[PDB]
Design goal:
Chain A: It comes from Homo sapiens (Human). 2 copies of one chain form a homodimer. Chain A has about 400 residues and is of the alpha+beta class. Chain A has 3 domains: about 15-125 and about 150-160 and about 265-280 and about 350-370, Alpha-Beta Complex (Nitric Oxide Synthase, Chain A, domain 1); about 125-150 and about 165-235 and about 400-404, Nitric Oxide Synthase,Heme Domain,Chain A domain 2 (Nitric Oxide Synthase,Heme Domain, Chain A, domain 2, Alpha-Beta Complex); about 235-260 and about 280-345, Nitric Oxide Synthase, Chain A, domain 3 (Bovine Endothelial Nitric Oxide Synthase Heme Domain, Chain: A,domain 3, Alpha-Beta Complex). Helix content of chain A is about 35%, strand content about 15%. The first copy, chain A, has helices at about 45-60, 70-85, 90-105, 130-145, 190-200, 285-290, 300-305, 320-335, 345-360, 370, and strands at about 5, 15, 120, 150-155, 165, 175-180, 185, 215-220, 225, 235-240, 255, 260, 265, 270, 275-280, 280, 340, 395-400. A 4-stranded mixed sheet of chain A has the order 3-4-15-12, with helices on both faces. A 3-stranded antiparallel sheet of chain A has the order 5-8-9, with helices on one face. In chain A, helix 1 (about 45-60) runs antiparallel to helix 2 (about 70-85), helix 6 (about 285-290) packs across helix 8 (about 320-335) and helix 7 (about 300-305) crosses helix 8. The longest helix of chain A is centred in the C-terminal third of the chain and has 20 residues, at about 320-335. At the A-B interface, helix 6, helix 8 and helix 9 of A face helix 6, helix 8 and helix 9 of B. Bound molecules: protoporphyrin IX containing FE (2 copies), the ligand N=C(Nc1ccc(CCNCc2cccc(NC(=N)c3ccon3)c2)cc1)c1ccon1 (2 copies), 5,6,7,8-tetrahydrobiopterin (2 copies), calcium ion (3 copies), chloride ion (2 copies), gadolinium atom (GD) (2 copies) and 1 more. One copy of the ligand N=C(Nc1ccc(CCNCc2cccc(NC(=N)c3ccon3)c2)cc1)c1ccon1 binds near residues 258, 260, 277 and 285 of chain A. One calcium ion binds near residues 307 and 309 of chain B.
Chain lengths: ~400, ~400
């Protein structure tokens, strides 16, 4: 059987036939579900089976399955693997593969956009200095003076006999987190480790709550090299609230461009350890997680006090009221600055449209309910009432160990 | 083999060793996770479940393997040889009811699991006696608004005989009436049972909060219609502490959440009629029942009264209206002196339960999607807690509708 999947708002029913194609295994068993875990995980013949599957996907996408070109590319990959132990993607295959990896990412609510992705081919990159040039070009294109455009830059693939390219930073733009001696943190606690590594590698630190980190860039078989981003390249949004004028005096800001730089991109059995990608923010990422998580900036109580809320009892719902107003400030501030942002209602609505498209196109869509449902207002969004099937398809974005 | 479980707010690590004991199989496989599905499940066997429950029982009272332990085992064997089933002792039933609550992965209120009043109704015959047992349960559990958790256990399923069943999904439900513009006056969830009460001879109301009659079914008989005495059904009119117009919306909800359509399984025995009640968490009423698009769906009405900008989602009018409805629910129950818990207090208590259960049993089955509240998810501590979901017995299970 194929899993039956129900939308409880509408009563509609589908069957996820795509999940039967899932190859790599997740952490669940019939005995117990581990769907809530953040980390679900941790050769010529196996390489070829993955390469063949990918080539088949490519020729399907362009409606040329079983063509002469399809058969000849399969044979051509077979011969390169037999000769050299590996192979190279065509340019067209790289573009398709990166879009597919995005399409396949189960925790991404933004996948209505998956076919609109600018793919920068950096597979000729030969040094950390040239890496930095590719990255600056990526940031300039993607930022586009606030009219954000999705993009990925793909650095050379992993290969035996040479180290990996790696970007040590988790995102291209991140705020420093200065671990204080009391155990407290000035800045973003999520970035304490990379801040200390930047210092250890010669960066002169600041002492602000929103200090932009330098990049630690690793070329093959080299220690990371420190590069500072041009200030003119890093677009930031000061946070203000449309009706609470004192909010501006909190001195809060966030950056325009979310650009994840520490995930591994896998295409047809080839691995790209350095392949940063960027899109635009959903406002709850900044307003709810980044600013209100107890272990991040943790501003909820400060705002609630300023709002004159009764923070002495849970039943006043002061936390909920303060969080709503912080999210309003984020949205208002980005819209005022003319920087692309999407609220969680519009994002989840577009994701429901994506599920319907993917049901027609492929018979299902891998989706991680706990990550698709926003961190506030969950059941006020349509995805809350939509059952979802989580599984791993390739091409894929994957977690990888930190390189230090 | 023992899953590692992390809290991402605090960094602490535990290992769930209890999941190794999971008796039945869930819907997930290494190929694909089906954790988000509401319904995960579509002689000699009775004895083995019966045996292992008796073993559980004696271990929990520190009488493991001793003298009375062997006597009870041999009694159940002789019982099933003669009759094809067996009888629980009253204390085994109490223990099994509490364990089934303690084991329920989707219940955020399990800090309370050790405090449960068990009404033994296994001597019941006829719907008229069911109705009397149910009325006594409601009166006890409501307790003038100082709610007390209770379960009434009706006779078990046996071979060659029908079941007792409560056709209603809860003891207190609001009617849902269809109209010729497609829509529903009342609760859309209860349209089916509303027309069943009408079919079996109930004169319907015309309100949005008409309390339904009870449809009680004794074995091998049609169900019988019973009216709940109005003074037995404690309701709470909803008002807001500062929005004076909120009262004029005419919203109400009832005090006692009393689930009456789930099956209780203990030692291989099955009780298809075993209603249980606790008290509400505020988001159940204010977010799910009142704001779900397929329930009362009042969110846009409240937002319009609040003069919010409903033409763009980016004003967050839905979020603001939701918070004030939840405020109204909390204020109204507290003013009426009816027990209620807000989602912040409830999730903090469930974290304490997780710590207690780690020490007691080495883990605790928990369904993240149902434990995290439907508003302000990440503002509660359970959001950042990884959880392991698995099926233990004794258990509460879904069952087919009697029709
Ligand atoms: C264009 C607008 C986009 C929006 C609004 C969006 C939104 C999101 C959000 C809210 C998450 C959850 C992240 C978290 O909670 O940390 C996510 C995850 C993810 N996104 Fe998207 N995204 C967008 C574009 C992209 C693009 C262009 C890519 C890759 C080409 C991408 C790939 C991913 C991946 C791989 C994850 C999973 C991360 C993980 O598992 O930790 N997204 N996205
Ligand atoms: C005393 C206060 C209690 C509170 C605050 C509470 C809270 C909750 C909540 C919020 C849910 C989610 C239900 C939904 O969203 O539809 C739930 C589920 C559940 N509760 Fe509790 N509960 C309480 C008492 C009890 C008792 C006394 C029992 C049984 C003896 C029980 C057994 C269950 C079961 C079996 C479920 C699973 C429901 C399902 O899977 O459909 N609960 N509880
Ligand atoms: N578990 C650890 N932390 C940990 C693990 C996983 C995560 C997931 C964070 N994803 C950041 C992210 C990913 C994808 C999309 C967005 N958002 C966009 N809008 C966007 C970004 C690019 O395009 N669009 C944001 C975060 C922290 C850990 C601790 C030590 O080591 N690891
Ligand atoms: N199966 C159908 N829907 C369906 C299926 C499952 C559910 C789950 C709802 N559980 C109700 C419930 C269960 C447990 C606790 C509470 N709350 C308490 N606080 C409480 C109650 C008693 O003690 N404490 C509420 C709801 C609807 C269906 C389809 C067609 O028709 N019906
Ligand atoms: C324990 C839990 O899996 C973890 O906190 C998850 C829950 N869902 C999430 N969902 C999103 N979008 N982002 C997250 O970081 C998380 N964290
Ligand atoms: C699709 C999804 O599983 C479904 O809507 C679930 C999600 N989580 C829930 N959580 C609670 N507490 N109650 C529910 O009814 C649900 N519904
Ligand atoms: Ca070549
Ligand atoms: Ca008509
Ligand atoms: Ca207006
Ligand atoms: Cl982020
Ligand atoms: Cl309810
Ligand atoms: Gd003001
Ligand atoms: Gd007015
Ligand atoms: Zn699972």
């Amino acid at each position: 059987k194929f899993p039956r999947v129900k939308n409880w708002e509408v009563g509609s029913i589908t069957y996820d036939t795509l999940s039967a194609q899932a190859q790599q295994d997740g952490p669940c068993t019939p005995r117990r579900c581990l769907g809530s875990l953040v980390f679900p995980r941790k050769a010529p013949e196996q390489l070829l089976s993955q390469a063949r599957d990918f080539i088949n996907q490519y020729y399907s996408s362009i409606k040329r399955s079983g063509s002469q070109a399809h058969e000849q590319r399969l044979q051509e990959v077979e011969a390169e693997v037999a000769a050299t132990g590996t192979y190279q993607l065509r340019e067209s295959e790289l573009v398709f593969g990166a879009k597919q990896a995005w399409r396949n990412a189960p925790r991404c609510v933004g996948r209505i956009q998956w076919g609109k992705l600018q793919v920068f081919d950096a597979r000729d990159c030969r040094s950390a200095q040239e890496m930095f040039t590719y990255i600056c070009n990526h940031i300039k294109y993607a930022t586009n003076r606030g009219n954000l455009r999705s993009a990925i830059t793909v650095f050379p693939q992993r290969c035996p006999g040479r180290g990996d390219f790696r970007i040590w930073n988790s995102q291209l733009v991140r705020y420093a987190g200065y671990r204080q001696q009391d155990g407290s943190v000035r800045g973003d606690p999520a970035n304490v480790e990379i801040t200390e590594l930047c210092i250890q590698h010669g960066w002169t630190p600041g002492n602000g709550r929103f200090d932009v980190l330098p990049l630690l860039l690793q070329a093959p078989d080299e220690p990371p090299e420190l590069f500072l981003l041009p200030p003119e390249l890093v677009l930031e949004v000061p946070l203000e609230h449309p009706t609470l004028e004192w909010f501006a005096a909190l001195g809060l800001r966030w950056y325009a461009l979310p650009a994840v730089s520490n995930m591994l991109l896998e295409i047809g059995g080839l691995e790209f350890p350095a392949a940063p990608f960027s899109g635009w923010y959903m406002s709850t990422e900044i307003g709810t997680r980044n600013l209100c998580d107890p272990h991040r900036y943790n501003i909820l109580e400060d705002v609630a006090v300023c709002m004159d809320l009764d923070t002495r009892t849970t039943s006043s719902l002061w936390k909920d009221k303060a969080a709503v107003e912080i999210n309003v400030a984020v949205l208002h501030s980005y819209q005022l600055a003319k920087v692309t942002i999407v609220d969680h209602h519009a994002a989840t609505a577009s994701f429901m449209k994506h599920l319907e498209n993917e049901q027609k196109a492929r018979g299902g869509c891998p989706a991680d309910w706990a990550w698709i449902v926003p961190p506030i207002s969950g059941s006020l969004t349509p995805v809350f009432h939509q059952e979802m099937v989580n599984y791993f398809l390739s091409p894929a974005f994957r977690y990888q160990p930190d390189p230090w």
